[PDB]
Amino acid sequence: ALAPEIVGEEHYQVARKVQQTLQRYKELQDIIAILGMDELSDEDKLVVHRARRIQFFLSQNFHVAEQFTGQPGSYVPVKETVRGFKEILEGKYDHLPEDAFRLVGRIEEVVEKAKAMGV
Amino acid sequence: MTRGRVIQVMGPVVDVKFENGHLPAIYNALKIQHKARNENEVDIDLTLEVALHLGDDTVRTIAMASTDGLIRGMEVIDTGAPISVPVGEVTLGRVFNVLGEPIDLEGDIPADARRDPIHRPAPKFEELATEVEILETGIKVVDLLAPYIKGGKIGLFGGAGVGKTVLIQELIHNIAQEHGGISVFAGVGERTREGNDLYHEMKDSGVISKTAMVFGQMNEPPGARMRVALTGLTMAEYFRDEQGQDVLLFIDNIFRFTQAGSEVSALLGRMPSAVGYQPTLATEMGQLQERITSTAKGSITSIQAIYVPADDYTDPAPATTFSHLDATTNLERKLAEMGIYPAVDPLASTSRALAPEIVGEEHYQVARKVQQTLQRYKELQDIIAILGMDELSDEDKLVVHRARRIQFFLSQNFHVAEQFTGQPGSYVPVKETVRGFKEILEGKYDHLPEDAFRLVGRIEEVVEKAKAMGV
Amino acid sequence: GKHVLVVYDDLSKQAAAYRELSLLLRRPPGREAYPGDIFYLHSRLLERAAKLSDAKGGGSLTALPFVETQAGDISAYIPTNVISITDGQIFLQSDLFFSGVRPAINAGLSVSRVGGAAQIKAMKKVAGTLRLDLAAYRELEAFAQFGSDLDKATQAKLARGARTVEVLKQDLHQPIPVEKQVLIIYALTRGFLDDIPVEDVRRFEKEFYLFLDQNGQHLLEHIRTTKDLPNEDDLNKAIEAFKKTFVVS
Amino acid sequence: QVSDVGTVIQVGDGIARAHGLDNVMSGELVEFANGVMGMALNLEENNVGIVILGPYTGIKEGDEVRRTGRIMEVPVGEALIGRVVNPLGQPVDGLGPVETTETRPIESPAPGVMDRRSVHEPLQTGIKAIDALVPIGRGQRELIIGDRQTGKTSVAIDTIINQKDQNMISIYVAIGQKESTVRTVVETLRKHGALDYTIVVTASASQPAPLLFLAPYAGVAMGEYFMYKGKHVLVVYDDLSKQAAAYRELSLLLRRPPGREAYPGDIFYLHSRLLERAAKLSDAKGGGSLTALPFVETQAGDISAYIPTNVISITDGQIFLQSDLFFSGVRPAINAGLSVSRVGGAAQIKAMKKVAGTLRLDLAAYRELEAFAQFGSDLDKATQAKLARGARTVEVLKQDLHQPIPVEKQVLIIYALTRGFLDDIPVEDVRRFEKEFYLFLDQNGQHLLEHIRTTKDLPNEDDLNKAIEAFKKTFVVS
Amino acid sequence: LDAKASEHAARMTAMKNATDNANELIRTLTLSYNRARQAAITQEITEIVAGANAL
Ligand SMILES: Nc1ncnc2c1ncn2[C@@H]1O[C@H](COP(=O)(O)OP(=O)(O)OP(=O)(O)O)[C@@H](O)[C@H]1O
Ligand SMILES: Nc1ncnc2c1ncn2[C@@H]1O[C@H](COP(=O)(O)OP(=O)(O)O)[C@@H](O)[C@H]1O
Numbered sequence A: 001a002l003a004p005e006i007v008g009e010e011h012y013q014v015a016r017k018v019q020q021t022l023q024r025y026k027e028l029q030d031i032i033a034i035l036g037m038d039e040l041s042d043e044d045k046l047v048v049h050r051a052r053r054i055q056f057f058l059s060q061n062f063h064v065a066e067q068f069t070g071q072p073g074s075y076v077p078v079k080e081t082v083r084g085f086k087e088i089l090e091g092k093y094d095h096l097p098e099d100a101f102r103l104v105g106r107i108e109e110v111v112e113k114a115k116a117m118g119v
Numbered sequence B: 001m002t003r004g005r006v007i008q009v010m011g012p013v014v015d016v017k018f019e020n021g022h023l024p025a026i027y028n029a030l031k032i033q034h035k036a037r038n039e040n041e042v043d044i045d046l047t048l049e050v051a052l053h054l055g056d057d058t059v060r061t062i063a064m065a066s067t068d069g070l071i072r073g074m075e076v077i078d079t080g081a082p083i084s085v086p087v088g089e090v091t092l093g094r095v096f097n098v099l100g101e102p103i104d105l106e107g108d109i110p111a112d113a114r115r116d117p118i119h120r121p122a123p124k125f126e127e128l129a130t131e132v133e134i135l136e137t138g139i140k141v142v143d144l145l146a147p148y149i150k151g152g153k154i155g156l157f158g159g160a161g162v163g164k165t166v167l168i169q170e171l172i173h174n175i176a177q178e179h180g181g182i183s184v185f186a187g188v189g190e191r192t193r194e195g196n197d198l199y200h201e202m203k204d205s206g207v208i209s210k211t212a213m214v215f216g217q218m219n220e221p222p223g224a225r226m227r228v229a230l231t232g233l234t235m236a237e238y239f240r241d242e243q244g245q246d247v248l249l250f251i252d253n254i255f256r257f258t259q260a261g262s263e264v265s266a267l268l269g270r271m272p273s274a275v276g277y278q279p280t281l282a283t284e285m286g287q288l289q290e291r292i293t294s295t296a297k298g299s300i301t302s303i304q305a306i307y308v309p310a311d312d313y314t315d316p317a318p319a320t321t322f323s324h325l326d327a328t329t330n331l332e333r334k335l336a337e338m339g340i341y342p343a344v345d346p347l348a349s350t351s352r353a354l355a356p357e358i359v360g361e362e363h364y365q366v367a368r369k370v371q372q373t374l375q376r377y378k379e380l381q382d383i384i385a386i387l388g389m390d391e392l393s394d395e396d397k398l399v400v401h402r403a404r405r406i407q408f409f410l411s412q413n414f415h416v417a418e419q420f421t422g423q424p425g426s427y428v429p430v431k432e433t434v435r436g437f438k439e440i441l442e443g444k445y446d447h448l449p450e451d452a453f454r455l456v457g458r459i460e461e462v463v464e465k466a467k468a469m470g471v
Numbered sequence C: 001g002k003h004v005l006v007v008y009d010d011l012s013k014q015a016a017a018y019r020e021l022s023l024l025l026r027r028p029p030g031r032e033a034y035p036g037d038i039f040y041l042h043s044r045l046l047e048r049a050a051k052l053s054d055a056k057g058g059g060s061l062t063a064l065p066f067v068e069t070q071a072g073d074i075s076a077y078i079p080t081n082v083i084s085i086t087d088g089q090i091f092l093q094s095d096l097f098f099s100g101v102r103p104a105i106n107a108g109l110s111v112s113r114v115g116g117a118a119q120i121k122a123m124k125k126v127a128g129t130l131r132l133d134l135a136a137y138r139e140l141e142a143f144a145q146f147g148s149d150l151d152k153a154t155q156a157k158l159a160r161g162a163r164t165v166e167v168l169k170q171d172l173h174q175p176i177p178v179e180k181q182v183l184i185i186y187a188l189t190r191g192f193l194d195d196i197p198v199e200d201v202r203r204f205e206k207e208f209y210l211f212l213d214q215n216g217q218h219l220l221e222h223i224r225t226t227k228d229l230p231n232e233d234d235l236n237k238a239i240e241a242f243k244k245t246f247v248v249s
Numbered sequence D: 001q002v003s004d005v006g007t008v009i010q011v012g013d014g015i016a017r018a019h020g021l022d023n024v025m026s027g028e029l030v031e032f033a034n035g036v037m038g039m040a041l042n043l044e045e046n047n048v049g050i051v052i053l054g055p056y057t058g059i060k061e062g063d064e065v066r067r068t069g070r071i072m073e074v075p076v077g078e079a080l081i082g083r084v085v086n087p088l089g090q091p092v093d094g095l096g097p098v099e100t101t102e103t104r105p106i107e108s109p110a111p112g113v114m115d116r117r118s119v120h121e122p123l124q125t126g127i128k129a130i131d132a133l134v135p136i137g138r139g140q141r142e143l144i145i146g147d148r149q150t151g152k153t154s155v156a157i158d159t160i161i162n163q164k165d166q167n168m169i170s171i172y173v174a175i176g177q178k179e180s181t182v183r184t185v186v187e188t189l190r191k192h193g194a195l196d197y198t199i200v201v202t203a204s205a206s207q208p209a210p211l212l213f214l215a216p217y218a219g220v221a222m223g224e225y226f227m228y229k230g231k232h233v234l235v236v237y238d239d240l241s242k243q244a245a246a247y248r249e250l251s252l253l254l255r256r257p258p259g260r261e262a263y264p265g266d267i268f269y270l271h272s273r274l275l276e277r278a279a280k281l282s283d284a285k286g287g288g289s290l291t292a293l294p295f296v297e298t299q300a301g302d303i304s305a306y307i308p309t310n311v312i313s314i315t316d317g318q319i320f321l322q323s324d325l326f327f328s329g330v331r332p333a334i335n336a337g338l339s340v341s342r343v344g345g346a347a348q349i350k351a352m353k354k355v356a357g358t359l360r361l362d363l364a365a366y367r368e369l370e371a372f373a374q375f376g377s378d379l380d381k382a383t384q385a386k387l388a389r390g391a392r393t394v395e396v397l398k399q400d401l402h403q404p405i406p407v408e409k410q411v412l413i414i415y416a417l418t419r420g421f422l423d424d425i426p427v428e429d430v431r432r433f434e435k436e437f438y439l440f441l442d443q444n445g446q447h448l449l450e451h452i453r454t455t456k457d458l459p460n461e462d463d464l465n466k467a468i469e470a471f472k473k474t475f476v477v478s
Numbered sequence E: 001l002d003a004k005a006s007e008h009a010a011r012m013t014a015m016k017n018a019t020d021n022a023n024e025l026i027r028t029l030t031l032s033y034n035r036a037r038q039a040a041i042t043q044e045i046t047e048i049v050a051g052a053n054a055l
């Protein structure tokens, strides 16, 4: 179902860009390990910075998971997911910490979690 | 005189039962010739090779063609001898199959012609000859770094699309033109398109008048695909055994021969070897290769192309054939993509004839110095790749400057490459090539552009190309 | 006398079915439990494709068998058997697919023995430099991780290779005529594209295809009729005219 | 009667089954109708399995098998000296039959734990690197391992030739090579005069698998005769890997289950039986000894392979030849870092032992400091000593083909190297310096050579130094 | 001049550490590959044994 005529160009481009960034971050692992983080170009540093946040934002809190952890869970619409991932790709949320993106719902909950942590 | 009967059909495997005391010997040929007795049958003309004696008057055989239409109880005729193929001056200019039956539609061989058995023992210790002579081929890389030995065995290694078939065709052309000797081509596992192209090219060039050719396409059963090589070897052995000629035998691919042997073993039901090959791989390789030797009357030198699956040289088929080779040639797709044909690796190719007392002190020194310069240039590339060549010392810059020209001058234009490029080929004597490489090493052509050394013949043609380029 | 194209979608599944039948018939197995005659089967199937001579009618039949690999293992039994038979192979990689390079043909591993004879004269003219450029780019790409201060020729080669990779990209269900493929490849390989940024290559190609329909129809007709490249001056002038009106971001 | 005769009921892949032969012994030799020999391997309940030792294409179902009454054995005796023969004792060079009058079984027990003695006698191979870095004693089993075309055969031939004036008998076993290659080896041995004390056993690639499997055992059986008569024997095995391949072929044809990495489970037992029969006998069993030099081929120098590991575990040491060193012009190609002999060193002579220690240190130091030669610096820590002495050591350790040299001359040249007498000579002139020094010794140092040859010790240091200086006076640098 | 010397020393130590890290990764990956392929070899042996038994 992941085709431009089925989900729309707005969705398709975001999905493809997320996949490309994650693939590049996966490829960069060996050079990071054997050369250090400071030896990457400013493009690759930004790629890693965005990709870690995207990977953390891919996580979610489930309703049935409330028996394992005290978090209640959430339901996120497709429009909200697409908008949040587009905003992350645009660099709006580069100043927030990495772990603020883990196990949340909409992109707003990242902002409230960062404020609770003290940004 | 008694006949057999078909008992079992298991695809390309047929079981035949004979009368007690009249069993055929191993490797004998059995003939099946049946006419349709009614509308529910088809005419059959098939031959079988004896493989095992199962006991109780039963024989296990492998078929040389399709077994479709066989009916249990069919009559089998025993020929009393292994597969015998026509041999002599008759075979020149013709194309044969595994059974020696012509497939060029030029007429059948006379039935009274001499025929020799495929299977025979190798020459003994007393009758072998061990003199070493250099066989000039006219290819710069081969003549310089991996000289060929008359009466020896030469293997060509590489992946798909590197140019082994084109190199074999060029060797056939050059050696036939500059020596006039007899040549035999055995296309073990030949592709039909490639065989047709080879036949047309040889007929157009006129070399066909002195060559006998045996194909045995892939679409034939593994028994035929395995026995084609022995058929070609049997055809080649005659010209030294009965005429004292020096003969060349070309084998299209040994890897397909090993594959056919493994398939036949699996059909016969033997337990697989290391990576699924036949347990008898080494013995079959020895039986094939040991008959290609030089004797008092004459010699047979063989050029064989070896396919390497997935660059893995540790594979049993490439590995087991190394023990029988006097010289090895390696082809690289990395060199092929750069436009340097024949794309022979100058550092991986080895030969036992590259000794001061065999090729000459001057030749040995020139070849060794070329190898040293290329090896030295190999390490400097990464430093050159990152930092500028100015970082290199004065001698290193000259080493790179001369190594580029040596690498480009190793390339050559083939006669058979006319159909690909349109540029006519050339033949280069070994004296000419060693003189040119010595001059390049000493540095009398350091001012010519490096592009003038690509796809060129003698060193004078390099100067001609440079002048045409505006030097 | 016709020309036929035949596509086999899973020779691996055909081989699996044949292995199932052979094992149910209790025939002795080979490696990976496959029967010994599987290569005979596949060669017998594939060798029926041929180009007929004029005496036999001149017809032809081409085959495009498909083989699936598990975790990219091309050394398996069926992959090796099919590789050793065909005249060439095309390799598709998920690493290239996910990195945005789709179609994901790996030009380094792919091979075509019939190449050259299966191309028009203009395409033969323009493909030679493309092959060398890609080979140089793939050779020098191993050094891209080491900073940016590389040799001027090296980053020039990297810049050319990046634009070549961008050009080779293609969409889904969007076939392109050869008379436009040759022109875009000529534009890429003659340096006219060396000043457009990498991110604009796709839009440049699309706008060039649009421009070639309103202007330069003579070049398209010349290629389509004579199978050769048009005059060098006219093509360069048309490319310059398009570049003048092209807008860059 | 069917007790001494039998009829074949099955033929295939060199394996036959016969009905009858009620009194046949396990491991016996049997005779077919056309003269081909066979071995009774499996004595099943109602039939006997026979391994055919020759061309099986001439054997059909229903022909007669004749019993011989003898456990498998090979001819032995001094009449075999100077001839090339097959594993069954049949000559292959013509020259008439071999007129021996004694036999010995192929399968024999190894000498007992109480029958052996510590190895104490040197074995001079005539190679500088072998005699210096990895000494070999008589009775030791030393492994020679390397890749293709690394000079293992050349090393073996040089070692055999060097035994010309030593009281040693050499046996060369060729397993799986080309028959033309075996012929060339025989020609070189005849030219250099080694056939006066050498027995050659050959089994070409075209021969059946059982012959390749049995050839080294026949060589051991031939050697044990001279060993138990009190003589010293040298045995060379050229392809234990090809022996293992042939044995795997035979085992798979016998339908035995495969073991680790497709080799049979007893592939270690196969080599242990063969290599365990070489030993140094105690005085109660006579002074005889047998030493073995098995060969193993690796793939791109992969020492950790199964067969190399098994042979390393069995043998007393190893000698490693490196393809990169061979290609780089170092034809001996012996890697002193990885090569080691553990039984040896006690058998090395005192004079050579007194210089081997310094030679090892110099060569080793060069071997960790060669890679820094991109920029020579740091003065004595790198340049004057490590880069110079090591390069000179590499130059002196080179040796030409088929030119073994006496241990006394080796001691002289290596002492000259170690004492710094070669510090002024440029690297290109070192080999010529050594060649001229050998002639100068042969002309003027008979007293020193006789002293070394008679005492196994270095002569007076002042006399040796003055002789070296006297030679260096007359040498011209060019 | 002092800064140039410091730069050269820093590049020295950085490259030495990079080589050490790369060699460590090489050792680990080679160990993993060698441990991995023996399992496939033994699985092939097991398949051969089972096929021989089933007949
Ligand atoms: N010290 C040496 N000086 C000169 N040439 C040498 C020397 N040692 C070996 N060679 C040559 O190098 C080549 C190696 O062949 P050799 O048979 O000795 O090697 P091998 O490792 O036993 O290989 P193979 O597997 O081919 O039997 C031969 O051409 C031989 O003449
Ligand atoms: N010397 C050469 N000049 C030009 N093209 C060559 C040359 N050698 C090989 N080729 C190209 O390689 C392709 C196939 O090579 P081939 O002979 O099939 O190698 P292999 O048999 O090893 O696969 C041919 O289509 C041809 O265009």
Ligand SMILES: [Mg+2]
Pocket: B164, B165
């Ligand atoms: Mg080919």
Ligand SMILES: [Mg+2]
Pocket: D152, D153, D238
């Ligand atoms: Mg050898």
